Structures are given as C-alpha cells and as structure tokens.
Amino acid sequence: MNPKRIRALKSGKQGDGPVVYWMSRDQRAEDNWALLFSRAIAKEANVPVVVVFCLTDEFLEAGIRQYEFMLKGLQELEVSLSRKKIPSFFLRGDPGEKISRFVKDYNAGTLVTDFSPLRIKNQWIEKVISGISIPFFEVDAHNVVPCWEASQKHEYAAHTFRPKLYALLPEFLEEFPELEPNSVTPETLSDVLETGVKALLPERALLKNKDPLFEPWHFEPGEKAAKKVMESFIADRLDSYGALRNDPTKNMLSNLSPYLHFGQISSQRVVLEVEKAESNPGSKKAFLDEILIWKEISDNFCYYNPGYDGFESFPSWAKESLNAHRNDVRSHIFTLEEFEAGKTHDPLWNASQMELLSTGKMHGYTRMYWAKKILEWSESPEKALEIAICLNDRYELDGRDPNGYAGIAWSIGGVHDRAWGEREVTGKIRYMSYEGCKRKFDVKLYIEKYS
Numbered sequence: 001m002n003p004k005r006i007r008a009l010k011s012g013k014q015g016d017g018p019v020v021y022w023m024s025r026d027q028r029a030e031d032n033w034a035l036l037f038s039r040a041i042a043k044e045a046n047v048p049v050v051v052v053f054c055l056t057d058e059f060l061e062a063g064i065r066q067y068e069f070m071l072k073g074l075q076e077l078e079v080s081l082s083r084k085k086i087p088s089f090f091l092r093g094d095p096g097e098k099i100s101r102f103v104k105d106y107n108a109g110t111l112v113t114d115f116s117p118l119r120i121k122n123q124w125i126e127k128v129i130s131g132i133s134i135p136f137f138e139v140d141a142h143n144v145v146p147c148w149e150a151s152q153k154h155e156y157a158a159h160t161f162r163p164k165l166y167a168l169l170p171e172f173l174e175e176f177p178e179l180e181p182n183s184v185t186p187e188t189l190s191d192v193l194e195t196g197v198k199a200l201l202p203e204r205a206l207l208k209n210k211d212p213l214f215e216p217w218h219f220e221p222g223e224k225a226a227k228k229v230m231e232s233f234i235a236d237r238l239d240s241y242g243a244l245r246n247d248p249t250k251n252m253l254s255n256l257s258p259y260l261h262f263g264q265i266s267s268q269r270v271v272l273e274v275e276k277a278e279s280n281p282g283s284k285k286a287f288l289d290e291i292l293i294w295k296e297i298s299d300n301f302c303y304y305n306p307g308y309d310g311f312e313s314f315p316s317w318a319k320e321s322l323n324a325h326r327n328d329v330r331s332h333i334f335t336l337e338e339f340e341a342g343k344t345h346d347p348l349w350n351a352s353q354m355e356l357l358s359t360g361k362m363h364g365y366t367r368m369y370w371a372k373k374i375l376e377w378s379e380s381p382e383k384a385l386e387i388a389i390c391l392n393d394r395y396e397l398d399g400r401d402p403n404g405y406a407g408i409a410w411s412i413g414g415v416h417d418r419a420w421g422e423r424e425v426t427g428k429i430r431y432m433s434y435e436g437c438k439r440k441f442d443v444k445l446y447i448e449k450y451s
C-alpha cells in the first residue's frame with residue numbers, strides 16, 4: 001500500500017460516518033488501488049466503506065453502444081461489491097450537486113475518487129470541492145506508476161518518458177492485496193438503462209435499411225468477461241502480437257481497450273500476467289511498450305497539457321510546419337457527415353470508418369491512417385482535430401479517453417513524434433500513404449470485410 005499512489009485534493013474536517021469512494025474511471029472491485037485505499041481508511045476509522053457512482057448528464061454526448069457497455073458492467077459490479085458487503089449508490093445527476101448532497105445526507109467522513117486527467121473530471125472535482133467540508137483524496141488506480149510520479153512534466157517523446165517509467169517499475173509493479181469485506185452489512189440500473197436508451201434512440205447509428213449499425217457481440221462487458229479476454233490474449237494472441245499487431249486483417253490485438261477504458265480490468269493486472277507468461281520474446285516487449293509506455297504517456301500528456309485537445313498543445317516544429325502549409329489547397333474537403341458516413345474517395349479510409357461504426361473498435365493501425373487523412377482532407381488542423389475527436393468519442397467503445405486525445409494529437413499534430421519529409425498540406429507531420437499500407441498488409445481483404 002504505497003502512499004505515493006494517493007494525494008490530497010482538498011483538506012477538510014473528517015466526519016465520523018462511512019468512507020465514500022466516488023468511483024469514476026475504475027469500474028471494478030478487484031485490483032483497484034482506489035477501492036483498496038478507501039477500505040484501508042475506513043478500517044482505521046472503524047467505519048464501513050461505500051461506493052458511489054454518478055450517472056451524469058453527459059451520457060447523451062455518446063451512444064447506446066458505450067452506455068450499455070458501461071451500465072451492464074455496473075450491474076455485474078453491484079453484485080461483486082455486495083458480496084464484499086460494500087453497498088453501491090448510483091446517483092442520477094452531475095457530481096457537484098450529487099456528491100455534495102450524498103456526503104451531507106450520509107454523514108460521510110472522508111471522500112476518495114480515482115484519477116482521470118480529463119477536463120470534465122477536473123470540472124467535476126471543482127464543483128465537489130466547493131460543496132463539501134470533509135477531506136478529499138484521489139488515488140491513481142489506472143496507471144502502474146502514479147501519473148504525477150512518473151514524471152514532473154510533459155514528456156515530448158516516448159524515449160524520454162520510457163526510462164523514467166521503467167526506473168520506477170521495480171517499486172510500483174507489484175501484486176494487489178485482497179479487498180477485505182466490510183465487517184458487517186451497513187431505481188434499478190435496468191430502469192436507468194431503459195430511460196437512457198429511450199433518450200439516445202433518435203441518434204442511434206442506423207443503416208439505410210433502418211437496421212442498427214452496431215454489433216454488440218464483439219466484446220462482452222464486465223469484469224469477468226475482461227478477464228477471459230486477457231486470458232485468451234495471453235494463451236492465443238500474445239505469441240503473434242509482435243509480428244501481427246500492425247496487420248488489421250488479423251485479430252491479434254489484446255482487445256482489452258474497452259475494458260481498460262472503463263476500468264473493468266486493471267492494466268497493472270494485465271502487466272503482471274503478461275510478465276509471468278512465457279511467450280515469444282519481442283512480442284512481450286512490443287505489448288508492454290503499448291500498455292505501459294504509450295498508455296501512461298497519454299495520461300502524462302493530458303495531465304500536463306491543459307489544451308491537450310487543441311492545436312496549441314502540438315510541438316513547436318509541428319505548429320510551425322502546419323502553419324506554413326495552412327493555405328495550401330487541399331486535394332479534398334469532406335464534411336463531418338461525409339467522414340461519418342464513410343464517404344471519402346479512399347476505400348481503405350471508408351472501411352476503417354465502417355469497422356468503427358459496426359464494432360466500436362477500429363484496429364490500432366488503421367486509427368493512425370484514419371486520423372491522418374482527416375488532417376489531409378479538412379480545411380485546417382483545428383477542424384481536423386474537431387472532426388477526429390467528435391467521431392472517436394461518439395463511436396469508439398474505448399473513446400473519451402486520454403489515449404484518444406493523445407493518439408489523435410500524435411496523428412494530426414505530431415505529439416510524441418518527430419518531423420518527417422516536408423509535404424504540402426500536411427507539412428512535416430508523418431504521412432501514411434494508401435500505397436504504403438498496401439505494401440504492409442492485405443488492404444483488399446480489410447476492405448471486403450468492412451463493406
């Protein structure tokens with residue numbers, strides 16, 4: 001129980017009621033430093049621990065696909081927490097009102113939340129701070145090394161973040177203690193889902209035949225389903241991961257991102273299990289570079305760059321290059337709706353958008369190709385960022401995520417990249433040509449599957 005995982009958000013006066021874990025990013029009962037820390041605080045105070053989750057007003061900015069995935073997982077989570085004699089309360093509203101009122105109504109003694117570097121979570125925290133007088137902590141339960149510990153600043157390249165992160169892995173990569181149950185026991189989610197689906201339905205993604213686009217059987221939600229996906233990745237896909245991770249015709253990725261995004265599985269758990277696996281060397285190195293270095297540098301990016309979703313956060317070499325080509329004539333301009341419908345003149349791009357539309361998880365390789373063409377076929381880099389973020393957040397199961405803003409910023413603005421050869425329109429941003437993908441994998445097979 002390393003105290004470097006927890007820090008104070010606001011001092012206060014400790015009450016004598018239960019310890020409240022405001023769960024947000026880490027929707028799981030196992031392998032959860034925020035829940036474990038909350039339980040430990042409760043034990044020292046001779047009080048029970050309680051979990052609260054905010055069903056916020058912002059769900060209408062995404063789709064049924066993410067709402068159902070999240071809420072079905074929370075239904076499973078209710079059962080698991082109740083087995084530990086830990087009650088869970090699901091508050092309909094936004095956190096500033098709901099958390100403050102709950103703290104008062106339930107005589108909470110201490111408030112704890114998990115860590116997200118996203119603007120909306122920081123918006124939420126500000127309102128909560130103004131409505132409570134009890135101590136308020138946050139625990140990094142999402143990263144192996146706490147984000148504010150891995151580095152003191154924005155890291156401009158993987159190769160400057162990687163040695164700092166790896167220097168800290170011996171301390172922070174460790175097993176989880178078991179969650180001790182509470183000593184004694186202190187509108188349903190199905191109805192909430194019903195109400196939300198009703199409100200979301202007019203905006204549901206449909207084919208011209210009015211049949212829905214989304215296929216919900218590619219990733220079953222919840223902690224138990226996530227563990228099976230991790231186990232099948234290690235048993236069946238990890239050996240080939242190094243060779244096949246850049247081939248979107250092969251189903252050889254871990255497929256863990258939807259579970260990692262909602263915190264239905266701990267990435268620390270995944271890393272421990274992968275470290276212990278005997279697998280092809282090269283493959284384990286490649287996978288750990290993604291789930292450790294690239295995932296946690298995305299939290300580094302959002303945490304230390306307030307404007308992480310804007311042009312101003314790009315590196316200076318990229319801002320200069322993009323500005324110098326701002327007035328170049330674009331080969332094409334597509335509207336947000338033309339991008340959304342997969343109606344560019346590039347069949348590889350359109351197939352990547354159809355994979356996103358139908359499965360809610362675009363292959364990692366084509367996400368890079370996809371975002372870079374939005375830069376190439378939009379009026380400005382600012383508009384490209386707007387369009388890519390809109391589509392990523394609306395349709396990825398793993399979207400609205402530091403990985404997303406960081407991966408889009410890499411794609412369009414060269415964040416965590418270097419300058420490449422100068423081209424018109426896109427400047428020195430790394431280019432990914434259609435013909436280059438053809439030399440890389442079977443583009444025709446990918447197009448057939450998603451068309």
Ligand SMILES: *Nc1ncnc2c1ncn2[C@@H]1O[C@H](COP(=O)(O)OP(=O)(O)OC[C@@H](O)[C@@H](O)[C@@H](O)Cn2c3nc(=O)[nH]c(=O)c-3nc3cc(C)c(C)cc32)[C@@H](O)[C@H]1O
Pocket residue numbers: 245253254255256257258260261290291292294295296298362363364365367368371392396398399400401403404405407408411
């Ligand atoms: N590139 C990258 N950046 C951050 N974190 C990453 C990245 N690649 C992998 N990971 C993290 O590692 C695990 C395991 O990786 P894989 O098994 O290789 O991948 P999957 O879980 O099956 O597939 C998800 C993966 O394709 C994406 O994580 C990346 O493409 C990154 N990425 C997002 N990741 C998100 O979680 N949410 C988003 O909204 C993302 N949006 C984008 C947008 C764009 C334009 C790009 C280029 C990437 C991207 C992964 O689960 C992850 O934790």
